[PDB]
Design a protein around this ligand. Structure first.
Ligand SMILES: Nc1nc2c(ncn2[C@@H]2O[C@H](COP(=O)(O)OP(=O)(O)OP(=O)(O)O)[C@@H](O)[C@H]2O)c(=O)[nH]1
Ligand SMILES: Nc1nc2c(ncn2[C@@H]2O[C@H](COP(=O)(O)OP(=O)(O)OP(=O)(O)O)[C@@H](O)[C@H]2O)c(=O)[nH]1
Ligand SMILES: Nc1nc2c(ncn2[C@@H]2O[C@H](COP(=O)(O)OP(=O)(O)OP(=O)(O)O)[C@@H](O)[C@H]2O)c(=O)[nH]1
Ligand SMILES: Nc1nc2c(ncn2[C@@H]2O[C@H](COP(=O)(O)OP(=O)(O)OP(=O)(O)O)[C@@H](O)[C@H]2O)c(=O)[nH]1
Ligand SMILES: [Mg+2]
Ligand SMILES: [Mg+2]
Ligand SMILES: [Mg+2]
Ligand SMILES: [Mg+2]
Lengths: 435, 131, 429, 429, 435
C-alpha cells in the first residue's frame, strides 16, 4: 500500500540496480524466479504481486547501449524483471550531454514516460522516485535531466531523490566530465527534490582501509550503495521503533530550496575476519560515521559547517544509547554547527538488522547506521569543477560536439553563472549573523 | 599563530586555588568565589578576547548562562576560537559542563599555563568587551 | 457515567496509548480478547468510563488511534492486546506528514479530520454523560503535533464546556530528535494555549535520566518510558474510576491547578520508583513517597523547580493509608519549603486519595506540579525559533503549503507573552 | 529513638565496618538475609538504633559505605553478611585518591560528597530522633582521611548540636605503611580538632602487640584486629541499646571525658582478652577485668600512659555484676595510682553498666582513657612533618591540586598549639 | 570499569609484550583464541569484551620493522589481538633517535594516536598507560619520546609509566646507545610521570645465579619483567587486603618532580629443583629483595640513600609478619635513609598468588614480592653515560647521521646541560641539611 518506484539511468545506474535488487530479493526472501518458499506485506513497496506467487519489481532500467541490459537479461535475475522495464536504445550518448538530452533521448523518452505511467496508475500510495544515475556519462546526465523535466511537468509534487556518482576530484574516467556535470546540475537543480552526492575515490579508500580488499571491483561499491538505499527504505519497508518517510528526508535535510545536496556515509564496514574483536556499540559506529575518513565524498567537513544530519539505525538499537552517543558527538570539537541551526540531528530507528549478501564482502552485524548529512564543505567540490570547466572553456575545447548536435553556447554560459550563483549562495549560508 | 604548551608535573609553578581565583577576578574585574563556576565558560571566552584582538565574537556567548545547554554552546564557541588560533589542545567539555572541581581546576591550570605563554602586555577595559 | 474518549496522535501517541491501554486492562482485569477475568466487582462497577459494553459480555476501549503512516497501526494490530480495539477506529493516512506541521494541520490532516470528527461524534452520542477528552501526542513530529492541534481546535469548537487533556512530549534541551522542531513546537504550544484546559509537559531526556539513575536500568527501551507515562496517566485518572476516602476527578484538579486560564502547563511525577533488587530494602510509607516526589530527579520535565517557584501542587494517592499522615507530610513539606511556594496562595496543595493500589505495589502516588520553572523551556524554544526564523530557515516548506510568515510572528509573540506572564506571576508578592 | 547513622570511609573503614556490623548482627541475632532469628524480645526492643525496619519484617542497617575504589565495595558485596546493606548506600568512586589527601578532600571527594550528603539527609529525615554520627576511617590513606574530614565538616555544618564520633587509625611509630602520611595525618587531625566532639586514636602496632602477647596468636590477620576494634565499638555503644542498672549513652561519656573542647582524643581498651587454651584457667571476676584494663599492654594506642597523666577514664561493663564490687575496684585502682590521675579532677572515673553480656562470655568491659600521653604521638608526627616540610618533600603533589603552603603551616601551628595545651594541662596543679 | 592500556614501542617492547600478555592470558584463564572455558570482572582491566565470549587486549604494538610484528601475527597468539593494534612501519630507525623522532616517526604517529583515542573513548575509568620501550634502539627511544609528547599534549593528567631497558654499563649491543639514551631522557623528563629502570646485565646475573640457567635467553628476561608488571597491576586486577593504585605509585615514589626514576626487584626467583629446601618466609624474601645482588640495575644502593620504597606482596601473606620483616629491614646497617624522609616504606597486599607459566623457568610459590625503590645510587649510572657521551662528543662521532636527518647540534648540547643539571639535582638531594 506504500509504493515507491526506482529509475536507473546509465550503465552505473543499471549496475547499482543489479546490486540493489539482489539485496532486496535477499531481504524479502524472494527467489530469482520471483517466488517465496519484524515483517508486516513488507514487500508491497518495491514488489508488485501477480495472480500467482510471482513478484515483480517496480523499477525501470533504461540505457541507450544494449550491453548492460543484455547482461541483465541473460543474467541470473532473468525471470524476475518484467520484460518491458528493460528499455534499450541503439547508440550510446558517448559522454555527450547533447546526445543524451536533445537528439537520442527524445527518441525513447515517450516509451519511458508511458511505462512509468503504467507503473504509477496501478499503485495506491506512491511516494516517489529513486533515481540512480551518474554525472559522467552522457546517457546518465542528459537522459536523467530530460526525465526529471518530464516527470516534474507530469507529476506535480512527489519526492524525487537522486543518488548520483559525483565526479571525483582527481580520479576521473572521462575527459568531458566537467561539461556534462555542470550541464546536468544546472538542468536538474529545479527538479531534484533532494540529491545525495557519492564519489568513487572515497569508496575506494573506504574499501582498501576497512574491507581490507586490496583489489576491489565496482561490484563492492555497488554493494555499499545498495546497503545505503536499503537503510534509507528500511523505515518504509519494515516495522520500526521510530519511523521516517521520504518527505521527512526532503524536509529535515533541505534548509534552502537551492541547497539540497546531502552526502552519505555507512557504518560499520568491517570484514568477517575483523567482525570479532570489537562489539559495535552505537557510540562506536556513530564516531566512525562522523570521522571524515568513512565519508563517501572527497570533501572534509572539518573546514565547513553542518547544516543538518539524519541518522538511521537498524537492528537491536537501544534509544538511550542513541541519545548518549548523539550528545557525545555534540560535545566534540570537529563538529561545529551553523549559526541559524541549533538543532541539526534527526534520528530514525528500525528493528530489522541489515541483510548480508552471500558471496559479499561485509560481515553480518547486529546494528547498522547510515548518516545523511547536509554540510558546507561540499561547496568546495563545486569550485573545483568550475575551475576545470573554466580551463576547458578557456580554449573552447570539445565545444563542437555539443554545438553541432542541437546545442547552444549560451546555455554553457548560463550554466556557468548558475554554478557561480550556487557557490555564492553556499558561501552566504556559511557565514554567521549579526546580533 | 599561537604557541601551545602542556602540564604534566612541575614544582614551584602550580598555583593555589585562591591565587588563581584572584587572578581571574583581577584580570576580568569580577567576583567569582568558586572556581567550578568557570564551568560557565564566559571567562574563557573573554580571556580569548583579551589574548587576541577579534578572534571571537562575544555576541553569541551568553554571560547570563545558568543551564547545561548554554554551557555547551559557550564551549562550542570556545572550541571554534581554539580551532581559529591553531591551538590543538582538545578540551573535555563533557566533564567541564557538570561543574565539578576536578576537571575545571585541571582546565584552568592548563589555561593559566597557555595564557602566560601567549600574552603580550596590552591593557583595556573588560567591561566594554563584556558590554 | 463520566465517560472519557481517548485520542492518540503521532507514533509516540499510539505507542504511549498502547502501553496505557495495557495498564488499564491490567487494572480492570480484562483479557486481550476483551473478556472479564477479574475477581472483584469493583473492577466492573466503573468499567464504563473507558470501556464500552458490546454484546456477549465484551468490553472494547473508547480509544481513537490517528496517524498518517500505516506502520504504527500495523504494529498495534499485529502484537498482543490488539484485538480489543474496534477496527473502525483505526483511522490512518498513507504518506505521513513528513515532520512538517503544515501537512499535519493544513494539508494531510484535512483529509482525515472529517472522518475522525464523525467517529468522535458517534462516540459522544453513544456515551451516557461525557466528562472530557485526553489526547496523547508529541510536539516534535509533524503528524502528531499538527493533527492533534487541529483535532483539539475542532473538538473544542464542537464542545465548549468539556475539558481536554494533552500529554505532549516536549523536545529535549541538550539533543533534538528532529531538525525543525522549533517551528512545530511553537505552533503546537500556540494551539494548546488557545484551546486546552491543561497539558502535562513530558521530555525524553528527563525519563532517560530517571530510568538510568533511579530505576538503575542501563538498557532502557521505549517500552519502559511509555510504561512510566502510562503509569502517570493511570495515577492521574484513578480518582474517578474507583472510590476513595477523598474522591477527585479531572475537573477538581483542573479547577485547583489553574489559577489563570493561560497557565495550564504542568509537570508529572510518579512514586515509588525502585530498581529490581533495591525494592525490599525500603518500607513503603507515606513520607518516603512524599520525599521522593518533591525533588528534581523524579520530575519528568527538563527544568529544575528550584530555578523558579511552585504555584500549585496536586498529589493523588492510591492504597490503604491514614489520612492524617498524608496531611502531615503535605504540611511539613510545605512548611519546610516556604521558599519555592507562592506566598499569595496559602495552602497551595491539593490532595486526592483512592482505595485501589496499582498492581503488585501496596500503595503509590502521582504528582502534578504547576510551577513557573517550565518557562525556561519556552524561552529556549523561543530563542531557537528566532535562531531559525531570522534567516528564513526551512520556512519555504511551510510557505509552500499555503501558510504565511504572519502566523509564525504572531505565535512567537504569544509564546513570549506567556513567558512574560509566567515571569510576572513569579515576581508577584 | 536515639538513632545513629554509621559512616565508613576508606578501605580500613569499610573492613572495620563490615566486621562491626557482623558483631552487631550477632548481638541482635539477625540473619545475614536480614530476618530476626533471635530468642529474646530485648534484642528487638531497641533494634531501631542501628537498623531500619523495612517491609516484610526485614531489618537493614543504617550505614553508609564510602570509598573511591570499587575493590572494597565488591569484596563487601560478594562475601557473606552482604545482602543486608541497602544497595544505594554503596557509594564509591572509580579512580581512588591515590594516598593523596588533596584528592580525598578537594578533588575526588568533591565528586561524591553531594551524593553522600543527600543520603545522609534522607536518613536523618527518616529517623525518629537522631542521636549522633560515628565515622570509621584511617588517617594514613588519602581516601579515608580526606573524605572523612570533608564529610565531618559538611555534616557538622548541617547539624551543629549533634555529636560525632571518629575511630581513626593513627600511623604506627616504628613502621610506616605509607610514605607521605605525615601531611595526611596532620591535616586530618587539624580537621578533627576543629569539628569533632571526640576521637578514639587506634594504632596497628598496638593491636599487633596485643594479639601476639595477650591473645597468643602467632598469625594475626586483619580479621582479628578488626574484630577487636568492632568489639570496642560494641562495648562503647552497648549502654544505649540495652538496659542496665546504670544506663549511659554517647552524650554522657562525651560530657564526662571532655573537660576542654579541644582535648577530645582518647584511647580504647577491651577486656577480657584470653588465649584459646588459657580461657578456663581464670575466673572472670570484676577485679580481674579491672587490672586487665589499667596497663600499657592492653592499651590500643602506641603511647605508654605511665609517661603521662590520666585526665579522665570511662569504664563500661556488661553482664550481671554486683555494683559495689565495681565501685570498690574503681576506688582501689584510683587510690593506688594517685600519681597517675590529675589532682584537680577528684573522682575522675565514669562508670557505666549494661545488662547484656557480649558473645560467648559471661561478662566483659570497655575502657576509654583521656590521658595526656598521646601528645607524644602528636609530637612525633609533628617532627616528621617538619622533617618532610622543611625541604618541600612531596609538596608539589598537594600544590598541583590547588592547596597552598599556608594551609600546611597553619595546620602544623594548630597541632603544636594542641601539644602545648596537653603539656600545660598535664603540668597544672 | 578500571582500565589501563599498554603501549609497546620497539622490538624489546614487542617481546616484553608477548611475555606480559602470555602471562595475562594465563592469569585470567584465557585461551589464545580469546575464550573462557580471589577473582571479582578482574579481566575487564586489560581485556575488553565483545558480544561473544571473546576478549581482546587493550594494547598497542608499534614498531617500524615488520619482523617482530609478523612473528606476533603468525605466532600462537594470532586470533587474540585485534589486527589494528599491530602497527608496522616500513624501515627501522636503525639506532638513530633523529630517524625515530623527526623523519619516520611522523609518518605513522597519527595512526597510533587515532588508535589510542579509539581505545580510550570506549573505556570508562581509564587510569593510564604502561609504556614498554628501550633506550638503545632508535625506534624505541625516538618514537616513545614523540608519543609521550603527543599523549601529554592530548591527555592532560594521566599516569604514564615507563619500564625502560636502561643501557648497561659494559654489556652493550649497539655503539650509539649513549646519544639515543641522553636524547630520549632529556625529551621524556617532562612527560614521564614515573620511569622504572631495569638493566640487562643485572638480569643476566640473576638468571645465572638463582635460576641456575647457565645459558638464558631474552625469553627469561621478558618473563621476569612480565612478572614485575603483573605484580604491579595485581592490586588493580584482584582483591587484596591492602589495595594500591597507579596514582599511589606516582605519589609515594616521587619526592621531587625531576627525580622520578625508581628501580625494580622481584623475589623469590628459585628453580623447581630448589623450590623445596626453604619455606620462603616473608622476612626471607624481603631480605633477598634488599640484598644488592637481586636488584635489576648495575647500581649498588649501599653507596647511596633510599628516598622511598614500595613493596607489593601477593599470596598467602600475613600482615604482622610483614610489619616484623620491615622493622628488621629498617634496623639493618646497609639501609640508611635520607634525612628528610623518616618514613620511606609503602606496603601493598594482594590475595592472588603469582601465576606460573607452563614451560617457564620459575617455580610455583605461595608468596611473592615486588620491590620498587627510588634511591640515590642510580645517579651514579647517569654519570657513566655522561662520560661516554662526552667521549663520543669529543670528536663529533656519528653526528652527521643526526644532523642530516632533521636534528640540530644545539639539541645535543642542551641535552648535555640538562643531564648535568639532573645529576646536580640528584647530588643536592643526596646531601643532608643543617639543623
Ligand atoms: N561507483 C561506480 N561508478 C560507476 C559504475 N559504473 C559506471 N560508473 C561511473 O560511470 C562513469 C562512466 O560513464 P557512464 O555514466 O557509465 O556512461 P554510460 O551510462 O555508459 O553512457 P555513455 O556515456 O553514453 O556510454 C564512470 O566515471 C564511473 O564513475 C559502478 O559500477 N560503480
Ligand atoms: N516518550 C516517548 N517518546 C517517543 C516515543 N517514540 C517516539 N517518541 C517521540 O516522538 C517523536 C517522533 O515524532 P512523531 O510525533 O511520532 O512523528 P510521526 O508520528 O512519526 O509522524 P511523522 O514525523 O510525519 O513521520 C520523537 O521526537 C520522540 O521524541 C516513545 O516510545 N516514548
Ligand atoms: N586495623 C586495621 N587497619 C587497616 C586495615 N586495613 C588497612 N588498614 C590501615 O589503613 C590504611 C590503608 O589506607 P586507606 O586509608 O584505607 O587508603 P584507601 O582507602 O585504600 O584509599 P587510597 O589510599 O587512595 O588507595 C593503612 O595505613 C593501614 O594501616 C585493617 O584491616 N585493620
Ligand atoms: N632485556 C631485553 N632487552 C631487549 C630485548 N630485545 C631487545 N632488547 C634491547 O633492545 C636493544 C636493541 O635495540 P632496540 O630497541 O630493540 O631497537 P629496535 O626496537 O629494533 O628499533 P631499531 O633500532 O630501529 O632497529 C638492545 O640493546 C637490548 O638491550 C629483550 O627481549 N629483552
Ligand atoms: Mg553508456
Ligand atoms: Mg509519522
Ligand atoms: Mg583506596
Ligand atoms: Mg627496530
Amino acid at each position: 500500500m506504500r509504493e515507491c518506484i526506482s529509475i536507473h539511468v546509465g550503465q552505473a545506474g543499471v549496475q547499482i540496480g543489479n546490486a540493489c535488487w539482489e539485496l532486496y530479493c535477499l531481504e524479502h526472501g524472494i527467489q530469482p524466479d520471483g517466488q517465496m518458499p519484524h515483517h508486516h506485506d513488507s514487500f508491497n513497496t518495491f514488489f508488485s504481486e501477480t495472480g500467482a506467487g510471482k513478484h515483480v519489481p517496480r523499477a525501470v532500467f533504461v540505457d541507450l547501449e544494449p550491453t548492460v541490459i543484455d547482461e541483465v537479461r541473460t543474467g541470473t535475475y532473468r525471470q524476475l524483471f518484467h520484460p518491458e522495464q528493460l528499455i534499450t536504445g541503439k547508440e550510446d550518448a558517448a559522454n555527450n550531454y547533447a546526445r543524451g538530452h536533445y537528439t537520442i533521448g527524445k527518441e525513447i523518452i515517450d516509451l519511458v514516460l508511458d511505462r512509468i505511467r503504467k507503473l504509477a496508475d496501478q499503485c495506491t500510495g506512491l511516494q516517489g522516485f529513486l533515481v540512480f544515475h551518474s554525472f559522467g556519462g552522457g546517457t546518465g546526465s542528459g537522459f536523467t535531466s530530460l526525465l526529471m523535466e518530464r516527470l516534474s511537468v507530469d507529476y506535480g509534487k512527489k519526492s524525487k531523490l537522486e543518488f548520483s556518482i559525483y565526479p571525483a576530484p582527481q580520479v576521473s574516467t572521462a575527459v568531458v566530465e566537467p561539461y556534462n556535470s555542470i550541464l546536468t546540475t544546472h538542468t536538474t537543480l529545479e527538479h531534484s527534490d533532494c540529491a545525495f552526492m557519492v564519489d568513487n575515490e572515497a569508496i575506494y579508500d573506504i574499501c582498501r582501509r576497512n574491507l581490507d580488499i586490496e583489489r576491489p571491483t565496482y561490484t563492492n561499491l555497488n554493494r555499499l550503495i545498495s546497503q545505503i538505499v536499503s537503510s534509507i527504505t528500511a523505515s518504509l519497508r519494515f516495522d520500526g521503533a521510530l519511523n521516517v518517510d521520504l518527505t521527512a528526508f526532503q524536509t529535515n535535510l533541505v534548509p534552502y530550496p537551492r541547497i539540497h545536496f546531502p552526502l552519505a556515509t555507512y557504518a560499520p564496514v568491517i570484514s568477517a575476519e575483523k567482525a570479532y574483536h570489537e562489539q559495535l556499540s552505537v557510540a562506536e559506529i556513530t564516531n566512525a560515521c562522523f570521522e571524515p575518513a568513512n565519508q563517501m565524498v572527497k570533501c572534509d567537513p572539518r573546514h565547513g559547517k553542518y547544516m543538518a544530519c539524519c541518522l538511521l539505525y537498524r537492528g537491536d538499537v537501544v534509544p538511550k544509547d542513541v541519545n548518549a552517543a548523539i550528545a557525545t558527538i555534540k560535545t566534540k570539537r570537529s563538529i561545529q554547527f551553523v549559526d541559524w541551526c541549533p538543532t541539526g540531528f534527526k534520528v530514525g530507528i528500525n528493528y530489522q538488522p541489515p541483510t548480508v549478501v552471500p558471496g559479499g564482502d561485509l560481515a553480518k552485524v547486529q546494528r547498522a547506521v547510515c548518516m545523511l548529512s547536509n554540510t558546507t564543505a561540499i561547496a568546495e567540490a563545486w569550485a573545483r569543477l568550475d575551475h576545470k570547466f573554466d580551463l576547458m572553456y578557456a580554449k573552447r575545447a570539445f565545444v563542437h560536439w555539443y554545438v553541432g548536435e542541437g546545442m547552444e553556447e549560451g546555455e554553457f554560459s548560463e550554466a556557468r553563472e548558475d554554478m557561480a550563483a550556487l557557490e555564492k549562495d553556499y558561501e552566504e549560508v556559511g557565514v554567521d549573523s549579526v546580533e | 599563530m599561537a604557541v601551545n604548551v602542556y602540564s604534566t608535573s612541575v614544582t614551584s609553578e602550580n598555583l593555589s586555588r585562591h591565587d588563581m581565583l584572584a587572578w581571574v577576578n583581577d584580570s576580568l574585574h569580577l567576583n567569582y568565589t568558586k572556581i567550578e563556576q568557570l564551568c560557565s565558560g564566559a571567562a574563557y571566552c573573554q580571556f580569548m578576547d583579551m589574548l587576541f584582538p577579534g578572534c571571537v565574537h562575544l555576541r553569541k556567548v551568553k554571560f547570563q548562562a545558568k543551564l547545561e545547554h548554554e554551557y555547551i554552546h559557550n564551549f562550542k564557541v570556545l572550541q571554534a576560537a581554539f580551532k581559529k588560533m591553531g591551538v590543538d589542545k582538545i578540551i573535555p567539555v563533557e566533564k567541564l559542563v557538570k561543574g565539578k572541581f576536578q576537571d575545571n581546576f585541571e582546565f584552568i591550570q592548563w589555561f593559566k599555563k597557555f595564557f602566560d605563554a601567549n600574552y603580550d602586555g596590552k591593557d583595556y577595559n573588560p567591561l566594554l568587551a563584556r558590554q | 457515567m463520566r465517560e472519557i474518549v481517548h485520542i492518540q496522535a503521532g507514533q509516540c501517541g499510539n505507542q504511549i496509548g498502547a502501553k496505557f491501554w495495557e495498564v488499564i486492562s491490567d487494572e480492570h482485569g480484562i483479557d486481550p480478547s476483551g473478556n472479564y477475568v477479574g475477581d472483584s466487582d469493583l473492577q466492573l462497577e466503573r468499567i464504563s468510563v473507558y470501556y464500552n459494553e458490546a454484546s456477549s459480555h465484551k468490553y472494547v476501549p473508547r480509544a481513537i488511534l490517528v496517524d498518517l503512516e500505516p506502520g504504527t497501526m500495523d504494529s498495534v494490530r499485529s502484537g498482543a492486546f490488539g484485538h480489543l480495539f474496534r477496527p473502525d477506529n483505526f483511522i490512518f493516512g498513507q504518506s505521513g506528514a513528513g515532520n512538517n506541521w503544515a501537512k499535519g494541520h493544513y494539508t494531510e490532516g484535512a483529509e482525515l479530520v472529517d472522518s475522525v470528527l464523525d467517529v468522535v461524534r458517534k462516540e459522544c452520542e453513544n456515551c451516557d454523560c461525557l466528562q472530557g477528552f485526553q489526547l496523547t501526542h508529541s510536539l516534535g513530529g509533524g503528524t502528531g503535533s499538527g493533527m492533534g492541534t487541529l483535532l483539539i481546535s475542532k473538538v473544542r469548537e464542537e464542545y465548549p464546556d468539556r475539558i481536554m487533556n494533552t500529554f505532549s512530549v516536549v523536545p529535549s534541551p541538550k539533543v533534538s530528535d528532529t531538525v525543525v522542531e522549533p517551528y512545530n513546537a511553537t505552533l503546537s504550544i500556540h494551539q494548546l494555549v488557545e484551546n486546552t484546559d491543561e497539558t502535562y509537559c513530558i521530555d525524553n531526556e528527563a525519563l532517560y535520566d530517571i530510568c538510568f539513575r533511579t530505576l538503575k536500568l542501563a538498557t532502557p527501551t521505549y517500552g519502559d518510558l511509555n510504561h512510566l507515562v502510562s503509569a502517570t496517566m493511570s495515577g492521574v485518572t484513578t480518582s474517578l474510576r474507583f472510590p476513595g476516602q477523598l474522591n477527585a476527578d479531572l475537573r477538581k484538579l483542573a479547577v485547583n491547578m489553574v489559577p489563570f486560564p493561560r497557565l495550564h502547563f504542568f509537570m508529572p511525577g510518579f512514586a515509588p520508583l525502585t530498581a529490581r533488587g533495591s525494592q525490599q530494602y525500603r518500607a513503603l510509607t507515606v513520607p518516603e513517597l512524599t520525599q521522593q516526589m518533591f525533588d528534581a530527579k523524579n520530575m519528568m520535565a527538563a527544568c529544575d523547580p528550584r530555578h523558579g517557584r511552585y504555584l500549585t501542587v496536586a498529589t493523588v494517592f492510591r492504597g490503604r493509608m491514614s489520612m492524617k499522615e498524608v496531611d502531615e507530610q503535605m504540611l511539613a513539606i510545605q512548611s519546610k519549603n516556604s521558599s519555592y511556594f507562592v506566598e499569595w496562595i496559602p495552602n497551595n496543595v491539593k490532595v486526592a486519595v483512592c482505595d485501589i493500589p496499582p498492581r503488585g505495589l501496596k500503595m503509590s502516588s502521582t504528582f502534578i506540579g504547576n510551577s513557573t520553572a517550565i518557562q525556561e523551556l519556552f524561552k529556549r524554544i523561543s530563542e531557537q525559533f528566532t535562531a531559525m526564523f531570522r534567516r528564513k530557515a526551512f520556512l519555504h516548506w511551510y510557505t509552500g503549503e499555503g501558510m504565511d510568515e504572519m502566523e509564525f510572528t504572531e505565535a512567537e509573540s504569544n509564546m513570549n507573552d506567556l513567558v512574560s506572564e509566567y515571569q510576572q506571576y513569579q515576581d508577584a508578592t
